[PDB]
Amino acid sequence: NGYTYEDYKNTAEWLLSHTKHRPQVAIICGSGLGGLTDKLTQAQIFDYSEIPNFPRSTVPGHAGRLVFGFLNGRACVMMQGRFHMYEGYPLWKVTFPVRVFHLLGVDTLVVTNAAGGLNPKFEVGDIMLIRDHINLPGFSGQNPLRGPNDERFGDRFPAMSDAYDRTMRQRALSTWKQMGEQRELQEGTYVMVAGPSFETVAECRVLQKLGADAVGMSTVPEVIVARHCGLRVFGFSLITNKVIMDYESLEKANGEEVLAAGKQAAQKLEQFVSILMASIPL
Amino acid sequence: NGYTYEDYKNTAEWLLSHTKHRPQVAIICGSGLGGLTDKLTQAQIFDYSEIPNFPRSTVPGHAGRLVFGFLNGRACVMMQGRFHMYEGYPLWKVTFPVRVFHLLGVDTLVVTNAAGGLNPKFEVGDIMLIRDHINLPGFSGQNPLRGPNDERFGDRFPAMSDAYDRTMRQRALSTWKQMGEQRELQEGTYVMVAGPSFETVAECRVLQKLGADAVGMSTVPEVIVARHCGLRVFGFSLITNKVIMDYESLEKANGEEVLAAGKQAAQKLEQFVSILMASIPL
Amino acid sequence: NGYTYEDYKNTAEWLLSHTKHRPQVAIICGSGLGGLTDKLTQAQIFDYSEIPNFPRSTVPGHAGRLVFGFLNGRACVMMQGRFHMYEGYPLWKVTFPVRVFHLLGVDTLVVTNAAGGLNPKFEVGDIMLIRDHINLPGFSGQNPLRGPNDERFGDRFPAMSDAYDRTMRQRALSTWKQMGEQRELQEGTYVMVAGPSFETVAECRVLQKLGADAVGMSTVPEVIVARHCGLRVFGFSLITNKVIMDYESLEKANGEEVLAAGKQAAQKLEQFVSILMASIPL
Ligand SMILES: O=c1[nH]cnc2c(C[N@@H+]3C[C@H](CO)[C@@H](O)C3)c[nH]c12
Ligand SMILES: O=c1[nH]cnc2c(C[N@@H+]3C[C@H](CO)[C@@H](O)C3)c[nH]c12
Ligand SMILES: O=c1[nH]cnc2c(C[N@@H+]3C[C@H](CO)[C@@H](O)C3)c[nH]c12
């Protein structure tokens, strides 16, 4: 890890002295979900590039910013553009923001992402509440906590079986119903794979056989660092496509559609997140 | 990645100005399949060591060369000796040649390798057409495309579900029959594991349970980079041994036998490849 | 790999000239099993920090030492405190001691560790004889033999299907009975995961579906290097906890209990190891 405790501290204090905002809830916007930033009020934008120690967003579109504001009665800080292992960043950079949030005073992390559906019951547009995850990269060594542990953040061996807050998941399922929606709110296991190339049929079958319901290339690292910090964690995936699971089909998964699904059924997640803020204690 | 676009370009131009040959089909010879180089005509050999930017073959036997020539009516470039992740090379070096081939004007990549048979229906000497692959290293981060993407080669998120050209696989199965052979042409999923040590019984069972038919320590990376490039891809594995899948057996897998199987039933693959060249469009 | 053959040699010769002891059996003590060092006679302690080239134990408790002595009629060398991939050490440092032992004249390696039980038949306190292992990190590239092979230690492609000496496992099962004990001696497959965070329910299910019986974050690397060396290998796991495999449960795995289980049923393993020394040929 190239960061010392001092680095996270200096970044936090810099942000704290450059904004009057004092966030409680940190929100990481997934692909095609950045619009969520338009709902904040008293918004204050910071480009990643101007924040000390922040990983500088190479060329996804040069759009990387931290937005502080209020979302439905709660002090928030949103990440529009998140870092991925596939871009070359080691996991300790990918999750650097998370530790910064903790030092800013955040106690809750909401993570969102787009994902391929592995469970056949899913349909494009569906929203999957994350009940659990399978950290394939972590099994091999790619775990954001690798390296000496700093007691100031947490313990050497944090547990992850209760990573996704049960209370929030319940309140989430409730909220979704209180709103009265067509499709039900899906729930399941998210499996992380490094990417960036999409899965083959054989691989799709492997992930299904392991019990995963949705597949993506992010999130798990941020969740592990958040939990290591003591943060309350809740999140979901926007199923942007159904992964090909048999050779009959003659269609390919593309980053184009993922942003397209995250175009129509996108605002659906946005509203759900804003409303869900009232369900977050303080 | 330690290579800049310029590096691949300079290597291509160097080769292009040192040979009159202009290859269309690149062929990577697997273990004990190097003999395939003896079939080229108007052959011109280049030691890896003399080609700018090429990874220098440590000590597999110091035998690493790029051979340009004609194979059954087609301009080829063959790799005699391929790079493996287990030797210490990062994946961006392992696949460096592939991007060079694309800049040389190659539009087809034929990959061959020796592999352990996981499917019980296989026998030593069998030839397995590769229909799909399981990229275990890729799930964890070891994917040759990790790092910033260069649009000149391809897209950020290339698909792999159609990696192995369906047309060539069909024409391959046809060719094999047109020849009238004893054993049928096997077909299945290739699973890549890093190695270099051989699998345990428990591991063999894992790979079988995942749906893999053959196991090796190469190929998948080259295939992913080729596809990212737009190359047509086809290949197969020479089953050199049947992996031990139960504790009853008292025999061990050894690099000795692998080269031995690749001694008798070796030329069988060689001919098949030469003849298959006529089935490759232009 | 940052070590040259010379480095292992110089470390061996340094130890050989600083102790009259000439070990035959090397023993690696797992978590909460360090007490085994109290049974040696004519004991001579070396701090890891004073041994040339040894990885310096960061801050697990600053307790890292190599103890030479005699254990029940056999010249031993014990590692009190072992290195883990999760602490940041690359595998070639984690396994550095193993190659040193081989140069000291050791011909047998006994590895012990604490592990989470995946097989439901297990209970806290149980002892599991290791019959086989699943090297998840190894599938992805994290194998201690990655990099050029040195013929002086072993072959390029060593087999692992017979890693755990069948004779010792038999003599172990015998010994356990000759002693007449309540609980039977368990036996099964050990799966290595990098850690340091504990498994989620979904992950627990994956590991079970793969056929693993116990889960830990060490051992496999040392075993592979030992075998590559020609060392006889035998070992076992102390089940310190039963991994949560369903959402009903409301308890979390913690490094606290692991050391606690390794407190009561700890000496049970210690005696078993001492007595088992008589079963090790010479
Ligand atoms: O089928 C899939 N496989 C793996 N990841 C995704 C995702 C998630 N994100 C979306 C984004 C690509 O469009 C990249 O960062 C991956 C959506 N569908 C799939
Ligand atoms: O049983 C097996 N397991 C893993 N790889 C192979 C291979 C393939 N290559 C062959 C070569 C060793 O002889 C090394 O680079 C692995 C053949 N049989 C097996
Ligand atoms: O449930 C488990 N999952 C993964 N490893 C362990 C272990 C083994 N060691 C023990 C030690 C933590 O207490 C760390 O190095 C892991 C015991 N129980 C479990």
- Tokens representing B103 are 């800049």
Other Cβ atoms less than 10 A from the Cβ of B45: the count is 15
Three-state DSSP state, A45:
strand
Backbone angles phi, psi at A157, to 5 degrees: -120, 70
**Distance, CA of C208 to CA of B235 (rounded, Å):** 34
Closest by CA to C276, choosing from C169, C187, C188, C189, is: C169
**Distance, CA of B146 to CA of B137 (rounded, Å):** 12
What residues of chain B lie within 8 A of the CB of C210, using their CB?
206, 209
Three-state DSSP state, B162:
coil
What residues of chain A lie within 8 A of the CB of C139, using their CB?
140
Q: How many domains does chain C have?
A: 1
Residue B31, domain extent: 1-282
Query: Cα dihedral sign for A229, C193, A119, C243?
Result: negative
**Distance, CA of C156 to CA of C164 (rounded, Å):** 20
**Distance, CA of C127 to CA of C237 (rounded, Å):** 6
CA distances from C36 to B160, C48, C69, C125 (A): 52, 18, 11, 17
- Does the N-terminal peptide bond of residue B221 adopt cis geometry, omega within 30 degrees of 0? no
> What's the gap in Å between the CA of B274 and the closest CA on chain A?
28
Closest by CA to A191, choosing from C141, B139, B161, C214, is: B139
- Does the N-terminal peptide bond of residue A196 adopt cis geometry, omega within 30 degrees of 0? yes
Element (H, E) at C214: strand C214-216
Resolution (A): 2.3
Residue B225 contacts A where some CB pair is shorter than 8 Å: no
**Distance, CA of C262 to CA of C124 (rounded, Å):** 10
Query: Cα dihedral sign for A73, A78, A80, A83?
Result: negative
- Tokens representing A143 are 């775990």
Residue B169 contacts A where some CB pair is shorter than 8 Å: no
8 Å CB contact of A146 and C196: yes
**Distance, CA of C145 to CA of B200 (rounded, Å):** 16
Closest by CA to A39, choosing from A277, A271, A282, is: A271
Closest by CA to B114, choosing from B268, B227, B245, B225, is: B268
Dihedral of CA atoms A114, A120, A126, A132 in degrees, nearest 10, equals: -60
Residue closest via CA to ligand 2's atom 17 equals: B115
CATH of the domain at C121: 3.40.50.1580
Which positions ≥6 away from B267 have C-beta within 8 Å?
Answer: B35
Question: How remote is the CA of residue C120 from the centroid of ligand 1, in Å?
Answer: 36
**Distance, CA of C77 to CA of C63 (rounded, Å):** 16
SS3 content of chain A, % helix, strand, coil (to 5): 35, 25, 45
CB B219 within 8 A of CB B196: no
What residues of chain C lie within 8 A of the CB of B202, using their CB?
132-134, 189, 211-212
For Cα atoms A195, A198, A203, give the angle at the middle one, nearest 5 degrees: 95
8 Å CB contact of C197 and A224: yes
Q: Which residues pair with B27 in a beta bridge?
A: B78, B110
CB C105 within 8 A of CB C67: no
Under 8 Å CB pairs connecting chains A and B tally to 100
Chain C residue at shortest CA distance from A134: C203
| Elucidation method | X-ray
- Which residue bears the tokens 């999923």? B189
SS (H, E, C) C227-238: HHHCCEEEEEEE
- Tokens representing B238 are 């020479």
The rounded radius of gyration (Å) of the Cα atoms in chain C is 18
**Distance, CA of C242 to CA of C115 (rounded, Å):** 9
In B123-213, at which residue ranges do the beta strands (DSSP E only) sit? 127-135, 186-192
Contact A112 CB / ligand 1 (< 6 Å): no
Question: How remote is the CA of residue C253 from the centroid of ligand 3, in Å?
Answer: 8
CB B54 within 8 A of CB B96: yes
From the list A137, A244, A255, the residue facing B140 with the nearest CB is A137
Ligand 2 atom at minimum distance from B114 CA: 8
**Distance, CA of B271 to CA of B256 (rounded, Å):** 23
Element (H, E) at C144: none
For Cα atoms B184, B186, B188, give the angle at the middle one, nearest 5 degrees: 165
- Burial category of B82 from C-beta neighbours within 10 Å (exposed 0-12, middle 13-18, buried 19 and up): buried
For Cα atoms A83, A84, A88, give the angle at the middle one, nearest 5 degrees: 105
Three-state DSSP state, C206:
helix
- Burial category of B254 from C-beta neighbours within 10 Å (exposed 0-12, middle 13-18, buried 19 and up): middle
Backbone angles phi, psi at A39, to 5 degrees: -90, -15
Q: Which residues pair with A214 in a beta bridge?
A: A117, A190
CB A263 within 8 A of CB A243: no
- Does the N-terminal peptide bond of residue A97 adopt cis geometry, omega within 30 degrees of 0? no
**Distance, CA of C100 to CA of B64 (rounded, Å):** 33
- Tokens representing B89 are 């090379």
- Tokens representing C196 are 């340091």
Closest by CA to C123, choosing from C268, C234, C270, C220, is: C268
Alpha helices in A144-241 (DSSP H): 166-178, 201-209, 220-229
Closest by CA to B228, choosing from B171, B143, B170, is: B143
8 Å CB contact of A146 and C198: no
Contacting partners of chain C (3+ CB pairs under 8 A): A, B
Closest by CA to B142, choosing from A42, A154, A230, C142, is: C142
**Distance, CA of B229 to CA of A197 (rounded, Å):** 12
SS3 content of chain C, % helix, strand, coil (to 5): 35, 25, 45
Mark A183-196 as b/e (b = at least 16 C-beta within 10 Å).
Answer: eebbbbbbbbbbbb
**Distance, CA of C27 to CA of C53 (rounded, Å):** 20
Query: Cα dihedral sign for A136, A139, A140, A144?
Result: positive
**Distance, CA of C59 to CA of B17 (rounded, Å):** 57
**Distance, CA of C264 to CA of B147 (rounded, Å):** 49
Three-state DSSP state, C78:
strand
- Tokens representing A49 are 């590039």
